[PDB]
Design an enzyme around this catalytic site. Structure first.
Site, short mmCIF file in Angstrom:
data_model
loop_
_atom_site.label_atom_id
_atom_site.label_comp_id
_atom_site.label_asym_id
_atom_site.label_seq_id
_atom_site.Cartn_x
_atom_site.Cartn_y
_atom_site.Cartn_z
N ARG A 290 0.86 -1.24 0.00
CA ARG A 290 0.00 0.00 0.00
C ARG A 290 0.88 1.27 0.00
O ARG A 290 1.83 1.37 0.79
CB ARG A 290 -0.97 -0.04 1.19
CG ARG A 290 -1.77 1.23 1.41
CD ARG A 290 -2.81 1.08 2.51
NE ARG A 290 -3.37 2.32 3.03
CZ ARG A 290 -2.94 3.01 4.10
NH1 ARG A 290 -1.83 2.67 4.74
NH2 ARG A 290 -3.65 4.04 4.53
N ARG B 87 -9.72 21.93 7.43
CA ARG B 87 -8.56 22.30 8.27
C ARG B 87 -8.73 23.71 8.84
O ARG B 87 -9.34 24.59 8.21
CB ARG B 87 -7.26 22.14 7.49
CG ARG B 87 -6.74 20.71 7.44
CD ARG B 87 -5.60 20.55 6.46
NE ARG B 87 -4.99 19.23 6.56
CZ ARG B 87 -3.99 18.90 7.37
NH1 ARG B 87 -3.46 19.79 8.19
NH2 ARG B 87 -3.51 17.66 7.37
N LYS C 253 -13.56 3.18 1.27
CA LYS C 253 -13.34 3.30 2.74
C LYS C 253 -14.60 3.85 3.44
O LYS C 253 -15.18 4.84 2.98
CB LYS C 253 -12.12 4.18 3.04
CG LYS C 253 -10.77 3.50 2.90
CD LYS C 253 -9.59 4.45 2.96
CE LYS C 253 -9.05 4.66 4.36
NZ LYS C 253 -7.80 5.45 4.34
N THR D 288 -6.14 -3.00 10.82
CA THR D 288 -5.91 -3.41 12.22
C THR D 288 -4.69 -2.68 12.80
O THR D 288 -4.11 -1.78 12.17
CB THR D 288 -5.77 -4.94 12.33
OG1 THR D 288 -4.75 -5.44 11.47
CG2 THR D 288 -7.07 -5.68 12.09
#
EC number: 2.7.1.40
Lengths: 510, 510, 510, 510
Positions: free
Chosen positions: B52, B99, B249, B307
């Site tokens: 990744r 932000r 995601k 994880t």
């Protein structure tokens, strides 16, 4: 589609038509009423799959003429090779027997006996000419050793019963339990008793020899009592009738008690329901039937069940009203073929009886909860490494999922179609063979439809295989099991020979 | 072999060895700690399947050098074509963000705020240079419309919380719920709120374009909220990256609530467990994870789960005691690959972490009741007429019955192996392909082991097929999945092309 | 409500509230951080059910003051007899140990050893004063007979490992497998080895005697290895502590291998997960817990599981982020109580830790498929003639069908509530007793909520029974388990005494 | 004890005795053959539970003398109050009919008709005296409106069939489909046709009135077609026969199609198998029977099934061989009582027929897979808050677990025993009542054994309840259902009245 058996029963509809396919085989007895090439041709169209010959009556010359006539009607339709239907020939042995002597010398004289009267039974050959209402001569020379004190004896199909009172050497003193009429040469049945008669009589060694010479498809073996009896029959057929299927008839307490050892030695069972109901009490025959069909389904072995037509007891109306509850029962219990004896041999309306067997058999397949059965058979199957067993389980599961309309199987001995049929898939199993004896025996197993291929063996093997598959797809569409652009499962091997089935293809119908 | 789940747990033994095969994929992040062709070569041996690249940090020049280094280590082992192992490259977008402005002009200055103190939030660009403990400037120009009265605001990974007190046009007056330190350019998270930010930022249109040019295997798409967002990404990849797998995601309340519409639009899901635990309360993240793995198993779609390594809270002893309960949990829940972020990017012992993921993943496959899962997946499968679906169900059932050691599948797009793997058979699935991109993406699906074939296409097609089957049997024996005179299932098509799989053969291993 | 486990997982919702009732018990260790009558009172409100005293540290005078303080806080709430909550006291033995001698005489001196260096281990008492980096003295005098060649030795919680190289009479020559620091008086662990130490040490005969005198509710027995060890403890408690529950700690390969004989001799099991992870490899401890919780559920015996708080390994942020995956795991595996050691004894935030255990435990009951468990337990139950067993099965089935909100059970020894709870009904089980020791031990069994009744025994027995039922219905409504005009199951006996439960009534709540 | 249905069948043994208890009710028709107080007394001993009176034949004076004689034989045994057995009286209506006119004036003259011959059917009253082989007069004045073109007509129990050729106003021109003999006053049946005849004829309003005055237990209602017909009968019985059970006879296509609305309005169903087989084709009657027994089991409503004795069609032997496959079938299908019509009314051997029904019914309970049925009924039961429903489910589950020998239930209306019996427990259900009508109707529900209590109502209620329980335990031991020191379930209420059953006790037999 139901989750339960109770839901399944609640959703039965009487305004919906059945499928064309009839899974269960139809066995007809041939006597004088239907020995003729015109009557035969007509029963073949009605749905007869097997013709039974009873070797109690007639001579060897008379039977050979029935066989000739069965084959002539069969071969009449071998002109359109798509609509040809194969037809087996079976052979019922007379089987080992005990008989009384002549009454008062004549043989036509009848002596009536009343309840209470003690009579002697003698084995000595002096009294075999003259039997009176005090002395009966029986053919069995060992009856004294097999019978006990308190044992019963049935004379002529359970009309007269005798209680054993005093047991002696070469004589029996017996009370009379039921009153009737004693005739000459009447059959004797000994409940409970583990009889010692031989496996094959001197007459049946001659009939088993006649059948091997006449090229019969299967032999029905009478009065099987142990697994050694089945082995005896197999020796007499020799190594020239080694393909002939042995079906063991069960017809006394002993054969019932020793069932599991017989099943293993046999090629299939017949539950002779008339015969079994003389020796066993009437309300127990009911249970013994379900136990034996159950065990035959679990072992993957065919079970014939011999039935009858019934009528109402109180009869005021003129119509016969042929009640076929007896027939429908067996189809539901999970029998593979059903048999009709008298109705087709000597009766007046043979065609009508075959048409009845057919119509009942077809309709009663609706009420079975086929899903519960199917799962159940798959659980009690052992893990093996046999490629063929794994091909068959694959084929059957594929077939649920795509809702296929047929499973085509190429076979020589019949063995590959037998493995598929032991699961009871929803779809019809078409077996394509060149062996004409294999196409005949296929009628014993529930849900297999044999097709025989007559064409000459092509040069390239791959090309031969593709010819027999196509033949099978024409025959399937003609008989209306599936149409064009349906899906079928096809099952074959990697090389020529027996024992090499390993391939499964899912194909669109051309 | 157990009838129940309780029996299954009671029969677990700690004195028995595991199988060599590891069903679950292993995804490693590549940073400075493991950018080198010597570290990479060593992780490939340890069991790394996917590398990744995180496009938050670095430039396009820096990443292109990591990709080059990943490919060099991969191709090192392409000398023994039996022991070669393919390795994918994935791309995590930075994803759309809110932000804060610079604190007190400097950017290194920190202003601490206490509980109670009301502050104003302003969208006007005058205050973007100087933010104080009374005025904060946020980049989001629509915050006023998406936020409600009583809504909470999290500043910098949930360190500071702000309750919305007074809602006005172009300004927000907010109570302080938690005290911490405000820095410069810190990320903002708005729980409950159905945010209106675009699907792809102006930066990520450039990164998605860089990945298509660099030939990546899959794209991880950040901050997916609806099925329209997934469609947007697919347009930017164009028709030149139309094979690239999109993994959505899930990382806020909205994407969880609208899960079922995203799943359908995506190629797979990732349960970003760190990110999800800022927006959702800690004890609810637990449930949301199991719900999403459950739905991905039922739809036959791969689900990655991200994880971490944990350690004990009270630490007196010197050893770290890397506690991998987090990792074992996900394997049991039915995740397809597991991911390790920091431990491999910037950490000190990268090899040790890959070796841990492997050893845990392998062992925890023992505790699953695989039989209950397998039946369960077969019941919630629809009847179709697709030949391929029926071949796959056939293959999987054959494989139980003969206890086969492998299912070989020839594939071009990967689709035929995907159908087999959705049942979760006991036996490993070897996929044999020539397409090098197909061998890479195969690591996403649980229980598929890809093998790439390099040989030249033979003349006769039948002969080509028989070469790729044999290749697959050598590679199987080398890696020790079965030995000689075992049984395998092989699965193929009738003509060349995609979409024609229809044949299943049961063969002995040569 | 789901038919499958996969459906069950897919229907988990994160926008739905939990029930008030928390089925699982909470055991807290008491040390210096929480010895005070103000801290104690506050943990009782947070949900503490059992207070554990660790007899490794402190003297008998020091512990007697903790017990006094535990009882004072408990009895504070015995003014409103409806909202009183009973609280047990347990006692963890130090347990049999092997220790090294003093290093270089001082005891504060540390000698570091490197890998490879062979050292001698001597049993002779001359070297017990001075141990060097060549000679170590161990307290165990039989180590030579229990150890084999190739056996490993762990010194001080598995920091240093020693491979046995040469085996001799009264001396051991050992290679060094791991490097660390040897201190004075460090504990020794011998993997694989079937150790011969006594069941109770000379110290613990004194502590078991102190606990019987101090009237404790249960004893935690350390280092149980066989069913004879449990029998030994039972003799030392005598016939004056014959009600005290013995919980066997499992903490080596042998106790795991011989599990089934211990379970039978014990009153419950504790899976000491820290201790077990020194002797057994880390990835096997996972399976060994699970096997033991499974067997304890099937036998109807309570199983405590000793847990910890975890934190993330790579820590950049300031918050601790107390990760309770360890705790949630055990609740799901089917543990009856969970334990927290350090976090409550010496830690800085004791209240916060009890509040965490509670919130996790409550929430994680959502994810269990309670229906599959419940059916499963009912199948593995034997037909008996015991009236009580039949009453209990009746009560549990009635309770599904009417969706009752509680099962009220009157009990003296606790035995009738134990039989109901072994099925794991959905409804809370309220046990109504007068025996104060019975109300304390009830916290061990999952899903029982004890209520103690203080009122004077009425004259007519029938009238006494009707008072305790009503008490139970007030306490039920106060704690909010059911309201007026709901349905409850009530369970009682025909005469006074233990062992006569036989009646089940379905009543509306008054 | 078997896991499957196939195992269950395979384990049936013919060398094992049955239990004494016979679950299924026995209904006998009373005519001239068995109107006498000596024949009646003897059938009561043989196992007759209900005496049916057929109101086709006889007058009101003649029937009143049969009722008187039924009651005299019943009350003969009311001297030993332990061995008394209650006996119901039922009433079969003649039911609405269509009849032809007199042939050639005389009424004894018969005119034979051949196939093809067109005849006219006229509704005009001129031709009602003289009907010839061209003109038939029918009593139905609306036949023209209910019949369509192509509809068939059956004259005299389906001997003659007529196809409708030409439809006109007040006349029908009909082809002849079957040849037979037309007599005078022969009944007409119109398949398919939704007939418009009234619900009750002018004659049956008088018979329903006679039965309410004669205090009968239940009424059999002929030719039910819709749920409005059942409502009509209920109005004629009034509010003085409001306890009398209405059983709807189903006997045409319409009543079958509209089954579910009738079931709901009725107290039970009768499947009149003779009648249904005139209108519906023979092979469809088979399915319609199983569908209706299935639906009656699922609704918890009793279903009578009217059977016959059968004999073999080809009859050479002298014995009748009364074949009871018809009777055994229904017991297995899950009928609650079985009926015998002619065999007991006018036949020569009435006692022999009752003894046959008994012996078959008893034996055929062996072959049911009672476990699958029992589970199945419990799944399709709704969650309620009714205390009584929950008591019943409790009682039935307790009873498996302890293997109890009986479930004792106190009842006034019968309703509490009805709820228990809908589950089909293994154990006999003894109902203890004072109401003599309730003890009679209890014979309709399968597995309930009523006992009537004659004793005077005691002073204290609790003491009354304990007397009726004990009575029930004596009667249980006398009839041999359990001995001393066995276990029974007892089921009762908290106050006097109907609708308060809520208590279940498990007691040892005294």
């Amino acid at each position: 589609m139901a989750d339960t058996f109770l839901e399944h029963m609640c959703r039965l509809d009487i305004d919906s038509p059945p499928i064309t396919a009839r899974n269960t085989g139809i066995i007809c007895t041939i006597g004088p009423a239907s020995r003729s090439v015109e009557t035969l041709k007509e029963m073949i169209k009605s749905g007869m799959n097997v013709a039974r010959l009873n070797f109690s009556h007639g001579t060897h010359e008379y039977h050979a003429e029935t066989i000739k006539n069965v084959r002539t009607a069969t071969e009449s339709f071998a002109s359109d090779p798509i609509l040809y239907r194969p037809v087996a020939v079976a052979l019922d042995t007379k089987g080992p027997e005990i008989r009384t002597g002549l009454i008062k010398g004549s043989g036509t004289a009848e002596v009536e006996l009343k309840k209470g009267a003690t009579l002697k039974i003698t084995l000595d050959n002096a009294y075999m000419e003259k039997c009176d209402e005090n002395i009966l001569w029986l053919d069995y020379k060992n009856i004294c050793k097999v019978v006990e004190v308190g044992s019963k004896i049935y004379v002529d199909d359970g009309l007269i019963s005798l209680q054993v009172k005093q047991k002696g050497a070469d004589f029996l003193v017996t009370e009379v339990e039921n009153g009737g009429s004693l005739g000459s040469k009447k059959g004797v049945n000994l409940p409970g008793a583990a009889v010692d008669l031989p496996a094959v009589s001197e007459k049946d060694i001659q009939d088993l020899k006649f059948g091997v010479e006449q090229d019969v498809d299967m032999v029905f073996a009478s009065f099987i009592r142990k697994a050694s009896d089945v082995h005896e029959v197999r020796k007499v057929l020799g190594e020239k009738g080694k393909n002939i299927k042995i079906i063991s008839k069960i017809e006394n307490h002993e054969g019932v008690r020793r069932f599991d050892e017989i099943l293993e030695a046999s090629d299939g069972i017949m539950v002779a329901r008339g015969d079994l109901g003389i020796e066993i009490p009437a309300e127990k025959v009911f249970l013994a039937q379900k136990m034996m069909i159950g065990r035959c389904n679990r072992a993957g072995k065919p079970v014939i069940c011999a039935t009858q037509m019934l009528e109402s007891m109180i009869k005021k109306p003129r119509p016969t009203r042929a009640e076929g509850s007896d027939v429908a029962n067996a189809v539901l219990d999970g029998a593979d073929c059903i048999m009709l004896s008298g109705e087709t041999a000597k009766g007046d309306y043979p065609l009508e009886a075959v048409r009845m067997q057919h119509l009942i058999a077809r309709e009663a397949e609706a009420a079975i909860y086929h899903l519960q059965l199917f799962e159940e058979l798959r659980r009690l199957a052992p893990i093996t490494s046999d490629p063929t067993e794994a091909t068959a389980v694959g084929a059957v599961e594929a077939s649920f999922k795509c809702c296929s309309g047929a499973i085509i199987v190429l076979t020589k001995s019949g063995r590959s179609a037998h493995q598929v049929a032991r699961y009871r898939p929803r779809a019809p199993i078409i077996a394509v063979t060149r062996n004409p004896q294999t196409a005949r025996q296929a009628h014993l197993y529930r849900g297999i439809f044999p097709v025989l291929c007559k064409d000459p063996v092509q040069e390239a093997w791959a090309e031969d295989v593709d010819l027999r598959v196509n033949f099978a797809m024409n025959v399937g569409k003609a008989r209306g099991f599936f149409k064009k652009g349906d899906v079928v499962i096809v099952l074959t091997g990697w090389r020529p020979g027996s024992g090499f089935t390993n391939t499964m293809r899912v194909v669109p119908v051309p």
